Amino acid sequence: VKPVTVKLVDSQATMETRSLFAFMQEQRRHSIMFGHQHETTQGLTITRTDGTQSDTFNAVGDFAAVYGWDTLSIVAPKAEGDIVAQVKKAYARGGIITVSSHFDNPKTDTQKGVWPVGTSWDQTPAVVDSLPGGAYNPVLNGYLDQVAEWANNLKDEQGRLIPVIFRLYHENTGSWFWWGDKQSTPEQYKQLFRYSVEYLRDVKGVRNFLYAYSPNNFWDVTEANYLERYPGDEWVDVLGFDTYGPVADNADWFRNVVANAALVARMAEARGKIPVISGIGIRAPDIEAGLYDNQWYRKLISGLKADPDAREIAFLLVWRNAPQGVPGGTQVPHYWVPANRPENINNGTLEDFQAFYADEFTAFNRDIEQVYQRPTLIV
Numbered sequence: 001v002k003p004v005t006v007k008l009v010d011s012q013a014t015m016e017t018r019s020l021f022a023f024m025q026e027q028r029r030h031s032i033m034f035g036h037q038h039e040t041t042q043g044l045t046i047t048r049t050d051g052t053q054s055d056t057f058n059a060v061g062d063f064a065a066v067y068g069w070d071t072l073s074i075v076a077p078k079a080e081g082d083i084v085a086q087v088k089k090a091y092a093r094g095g096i097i098t099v100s101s102h103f104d105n106p107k108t109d110t111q112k113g114v115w116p117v118g119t120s121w122d123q124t125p126a127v128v129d130s131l132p133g134g135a136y137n138p139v140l141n142g143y144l145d146q147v148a149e150w151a152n153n154l155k156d157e158q159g160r161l162i163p164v165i166f167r168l169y170h171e172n173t174g175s176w177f178w179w180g181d182k183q184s185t186p187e188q189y190k191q192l193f194r195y196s197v198e199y200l201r202d203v204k205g206v207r208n209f210l211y212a213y214s215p216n217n218f219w220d221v222t223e224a225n226y227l228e229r230y231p232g233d234e235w236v237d238v239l240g241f242d243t244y245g246p247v248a249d250n251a252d253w254f255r256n257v258v259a260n261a262a263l264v265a266r267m268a269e270a271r272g273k274i275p276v277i278s279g280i281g282i283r284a285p286d287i288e289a290g291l292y293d294n295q296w297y298r299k300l301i302s303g304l305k306a307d308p309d310a311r312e313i314a315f316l317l318v319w320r321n322a323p324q325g326v327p328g329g330t331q332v333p334h335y336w337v338p339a340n341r342p343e344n345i346n347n348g349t350l351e352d353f354q355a356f357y358a359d360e361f362t363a364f365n366r367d368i369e370q371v372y373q374r375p376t377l378i379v
C-alpha cells in the first residue's frame with residue numbers, strides 16, 4: 001500500500017484514524033461494507049453480550065464489518081451500557097467502529113420520568129438554548145466532556161487510540177429530535193454541529209474521530225436540498241443519510257435509496273469525503289407488527305451496486321437486534337438482521353440475508369484488510 005494524501009476535519013488525527021479514512025476511500029469503489037448497530041451487544045441468538053457473538057455471525061458465519069454504537073453507551077446514565085470492551089474486541093478483529101449521538105435534551109434532561117421527556121425524542125427545541133450564551137450550554141458541554149473523555153481513553157492493547165466514525169445530530173431534516181428542523185433554523189443547526197466538533201477536537205483534544213453527517217433521505221433529491229443544513233466541508237469527513245421505508249410495495253422507496261446514495265456519492269467525490277448510508281431499514285412499526293419483506297436485502301444490494309454512483313458508498317448500516325423486542329403488556333419484535341432461528345428460516349428472511357452475504361460486492365469483517373496501517377500524508 002503506497003502513501004495517499006488525506007484531508008480530515010481533524011488535521012491532527014492519529015495515523016490509524018487517517019488510515020481508516022484512506023481505507024474507505026479505496027475500499028468503497030470495490031465493495032459495500034455491512035454495518036450493524038449493537039452488532040456484538042444485542043441479539044436474538046447470542047448467549048453473551050461481551051463482544052464475541054452476533055446475530056450476523058450466527059446467520060452467515062462472519063461479523064459485520066462496521067460496528068455501530070451510541071452515546072447512550074458513553075454519556076451518563078449510559079442506558080445502553082458500556083461498550084469499551086466490545087469496541088476493543090471489534091477493533092482487534094479489524095472491524096470499523098461508528099458511534100451515533102442520541103443525546104438527552106439539554107434543556108429538559110432534569111425532568112425525566114415520563115418518556116420521552118428529557119431524551120432525544122423530547123421535541124422541545126434545545127438548539128438555541130444550548131449554544132454558547134444559551135442557558136443550557138453547560139448541560140450540552142457535560143455530554144461532550146464525557147464523549148471526549150471516553151474517546152481520549154479508548155485504547156487498544158498497545159496503548160494506541162482506536163478510531164471512531166462519530167456521527168452527530170442525525171435525521172436533522174425531520175423534527176422528532178430536539179435538534180431537528182422545527183427546532184432550529186438551518187444556521188442554528190450548522191452552528192450546533194460546528195460548535196460540537198470544535199469543542200471535541202479543540203477544547204477537549206479528541207484525535208481519534210472522523211465526523212459524519214446524516215440527514216434523512218430527500219424525496220426531491222438535489223444537492224441544494226442536502227446542502228441546506230450541511231455543516232460544511234471543514235466540519236464533515238463522512239457524508240451519509242438515514243432512510244426507513246415500507247415493508248410492502250417498496251419499489252419507489254428503493255429507487256429513492258439509490259437516488260440519495262448516488263447524490264451523496266457524487267458530492268463525496270467532489271468534496272473529498274466518504275459517502276455512506278448511515279442507517280437504513282424497514283420502518284420499525286412494520287417490523288413491530290410482525291411484518292417482513294423476504295427480498296429486502298437482495299433488492300438493496302442489487303439496486304445499489306447496479307448504480308454507478310450509489311455503488312461507491314463505503315458502507316450501509318442497519319439497526320439493533322433487540323433481544324426481547326420493545327414494549328407493545330406484550331413485547332413486539334424490533335430487529336433488522338434476520339436471525340438463525342425458526343421464524344426467519346420459515347419466512348424466507350434468513351435466506352435473503354444469506355444471499356446478501358454471498359453477493360460479491362458486500363464486505364463483512366473478514367473481507368476487509370489493511371484498514372489501519374496504511375501510510376498517509378497531509379498537506
Ligand SMILES: OC[C@H]1O[C@@H](O[C@H]2[C@H](O)[C@H](O)[C@@H](O)O[C@@H]2CO)[C@@H](O)[C@@H](O)[C@@H]1O
Binds near residue numbers: 102244283
Ligand atoms: O438505540 C437508540 C434508539 O434507537 C431507536 O431506533 C431508531 C433510531 O433512533 C434512528 O431513528 C434510526 O436508526 O431508526 C431506528 C429504528 O427505528 C430504537 O431502537 C430505540 O428503542 C432506541 O432507544
Ligand code: NA
Binds near residue numbers: 027029315
Ligand atoms: Na461501495
Ligand SMILES: [Zn+2]
Binds near residue numbers: 029030
Ligand atoms: Zn481501486
